[PDB]
Amino acid sequence: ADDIVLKAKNGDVKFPHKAHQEAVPDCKKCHEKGPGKIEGFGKEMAHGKGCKGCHEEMKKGPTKCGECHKK
Numbered sequence: 001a002d003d004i005v006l007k008a009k010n011g012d013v014k015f016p017h018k019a020h021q022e023a024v025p026d027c028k029k030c031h032e033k034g035p036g037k038i039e040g041f042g043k044e045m046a047h048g049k050g051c052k053g054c055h056e057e058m059k060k061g062p063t064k065c066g067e068c069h070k071k
């Protein structure tokens with residue numbers, strides 16, 4: 001499968017899967033979640049534990065606006 005880009009108005013956000021599979025061996029961080037996780041994602045989740053928050057907790061990954069968002 002291909003990587004996906006989230007079309008944030010302020011700038012595209014790339015999500016590179018390979019880096020995540022390598023750095024996050026605990027796959028159940030994102031996979032086998034109960035239903036609702038597709039409908040649930042949004043800015044609040046992204047800037048929280050959906051993206052940014054995990055980067056902060058794991059001490060690696062982009063945490064600045066311009067590191068995630070890029071036109």
Ligand code: HEC
Nearest residue numbers: 001002003004015016017020021022024025026027029030
């Ligand atoms: C969230 C941060 C994830 C983590 C951690 C892991 N995966 Fe993942 N996976 C995630 C998304 C959003 C997607 C679809 C979009 C994309 O960029 O691919 C996937 C996709 C997969 C796939 C399909 C890949 C392909 O066919 O090329 C597989 C087989 C998969 N994910 C498995 C997997 C495993 C085994 C993980 C742990 C090591 C893992 N993923 C981490 C989100 C996230």
Ligand code: HEC
Nearest residue numbers: 013014015019023024029049050051054055058060061062
């Ligand atoms: C943990 C549960 C994570 C979630 C959820 C998301 N990310 Fe992540 N990401 C995580 C780690 C531990 C790392 C470091 C990987 C490395 O080897 O450097 C990353 C990295 C990224 C990157 C940069 C990848 C690179 O090759 O440098 C990007 C661009 C990124 N992450 C984006 C991203 C987005 C958009 C997410 C939500 C949709 C997201 N991550 C979730 C851990 C986790």
Ligand code: HEC
Nearest residue numbers: 006007008009010013042043046051052062063064065068
């Ligand atoms: C990655 C770890 C991010 C960081 C760091 C920041 N943002 Fe973000 N933001 C991210 C994603 C994946 C999304 C899309 C959510 C979705 O619905 O798929 C967003 C969203 C926004 C938005 C809203 C965009 C829209 O609704 O079209 C804005 C205005 C925004 N982000 C701005 C922003 C700023 C100013 C940041 C630094 C303080 C910042 N983001 C960090 C991922 C990430």
Ligand SMILES: C[C@H](CCC(=O)O)[C@H]1CC[C@H]2[C@@H]3CC[C@@H]4C[C@H](O)CC[C@]4(C)[C@H]3C[C@H](O)[C@]12C
Nearest residue numbers: 015029030033037038039040041042049050051
């Ligand atoms: C469920 C995990 C982990 C966050 C959490 O614990 O809730 C999060 C992390 C990244 C999230 C994905 C980001 C890209 C997609 C954004 C879409 O708008 C909704 C579907 C996708 C595919 C999301 C599904 C799900 O919302 C994921 C996989």
